[PDB]
Amino acid sequence: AVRGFLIVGNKAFTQPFSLNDLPGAGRMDVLCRCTSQALFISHGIRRDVEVYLLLLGPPSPPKSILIKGDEVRRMSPDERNVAGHIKKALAVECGKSWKKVHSGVYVSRKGLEELIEELSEKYSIIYLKEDGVDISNAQLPPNPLFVIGDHEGLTEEQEKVVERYAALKLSLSPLSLLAEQCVVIAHHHLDRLQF
Amino acid sequence: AVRGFLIVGNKAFTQPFSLNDLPGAGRMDVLCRCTSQALFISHGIRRDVEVYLLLLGPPSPPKSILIKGDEVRRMSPDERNVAGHIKKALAVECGKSWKKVHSGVYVSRKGLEELIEELSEKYSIIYLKEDGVDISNAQLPPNPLFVIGDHEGLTEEQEKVVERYAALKLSLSPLSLLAEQCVVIAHHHLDRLQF
User: Residues B7, B83: contact at Cβ < 8 Å?
Assistant: First the structure.
C-alpha cells in the first residue's frame, strides 16, 4: 500500500522566492500546507507517502517537485521549512527526468500530462472534487493517488487531462474544502481501513 | 449551532515574537495551523466558529486569545498572517476580561480554569485525545467546543481541569495526529451531520 498526492499550483512561482512572503509567491502557501498535511503525523513522517507538486507560475513553468516520505531527513511541518525545501528545488538546473535536490526532494520540468502518465504506472489516480461520487459509496484502490487543485481549483483543460487517467472522481465532504483539508480527510478514510 | 476550539499551547510565547521563526516562539506554528484549519474553507471563513488559544509560555503567562469567525477581517489561512494577528494581541495590555485587539480578535489573561469555566456556559466541552472513545460511538451536541493539546498534549493537571467540565473524551483516528488534523476531522464529522 502506497499513498500519493498531486497538488496543482497554477500560480505557484517556478524560481526561488522570498521565504517571508509565501502567499506572494503565487500562493505557495497552499502547496506548503498540502505537503505538510500529506507527510506529517504526531510521531513523525508517513513513510508510505509521496507528495507531487506541479508549479505552473512564472517565470519558468512547468516544474514538478517530488517529496518522498521514506527519504526525507530534515523537514518539519511549518510552512517556512517546507517552503525552504521548495525554494532549493526551484534553484536547481533540471530536465525531463527527476533530479535529486537533496534527501527525499526531487525536481523536474514535467508538466501535467507527463506527470499523470508516469504516476498512473504506480498509482490508481483519483480526482478529488466537490461534485464527485461520495467517498463512502466508493471502493478505494490499494495504491491511491489523489489529485487536488489549489485555492482556485483545476482549470477546465486540466480536468480533461486528469479525467483521461482518473479511475475515480470523488467527493469527501458536503462543503468545498481547502486543498490540505482534502489531504487530511483522504488520509483519515485510509487510516480507518488500515489501522 | 456553533462550533468552538480551544488549543492549549504549553510553550507558546506570551509577548510579541519574531515572525521569521514561528516554531522557535514555543511552537507558535502549531497554534497558527489550528487557527487556520478551524476557520477557513474554500469560500472563506466559517462564521459559526470561535477559536480560543491558550498560551502558557514565557515571559508573561497565561494569556488567551479569542478569534471570532463571524467578526474577523483581514485574516488569511497562511501561518505568517495568523501569526501577525497573534503578535498584535500579545502586545496589548489586558486583565482577565476580554479586551478587543481589532475586529474579531480579543485577548485576556485568563488561564485554563477560567477559560473552561466561561466556555462551559456557551458550549458542550469535548476533550479530544487518542485514547478516548471513537467519535462514532458518540452523539455530538449542537454546540461542541473541542479541547486539543499542542505538539506535546495536556498535562495530568490540565486534564483534571478539563474533565471537571467535559461531556465526552473522544478519539477521531487510530493514529496520533497533529493538532490541526484533529480540527479538520472534527469539522468533517460535524459537516456530514449538518449538511
Answer: no
Contacts of A20 in chain B (CB under 8 A): 19-20, 80
DSSP-derived secondary structure letter, A75: -
End-to-end CA distance of chain B: 12
Sign of CA dihedral A93, A102, A17, A157: positive
Given A20, A36, A188, which is nearest B20 (Cβ)? Answer: A20
Cα angle vertex B53, ends B49, B58, to 5°? Answer: 170
Domains of chain A plus CATH, in order, are 1-195 (3.40.1280.10)
CA-to-CA distance for B25 and B29, rounded, in angstroms?
8
Torsion, Cα A173 B194 B53 B156, to 10 degrees, reads: -100
Q: Could you tell me if B178 lies within 8 Å of chain A, comparing CB atoms?
A: yes
CB B73 within 8 A of CB B104: yes
Task: Tell me how far apart the alpha carbons of residues A79 and A180 are, in angstroms, rounded to a whole number.
Answer: 12
CA distance B183 to chain A (A): 10
Whether B114 and B95 have beta carbons less than 8 Å apart is answered as no
Method: X-ray
How far is Cα of residue B153 from the mean position of the Cα atoms in its chain? 13
Declared resolution, Å: 1.9
Q: By C-alpha distance, which of B156, B163, B180 is closest to A184? A: B180
Which positions ≥6 away from A149 have C-beta within 8 Å? Answer: A7, A8, A129, A158, A179
Q: Is B192 on the interface with A (CB under 8 A)?
A: yes
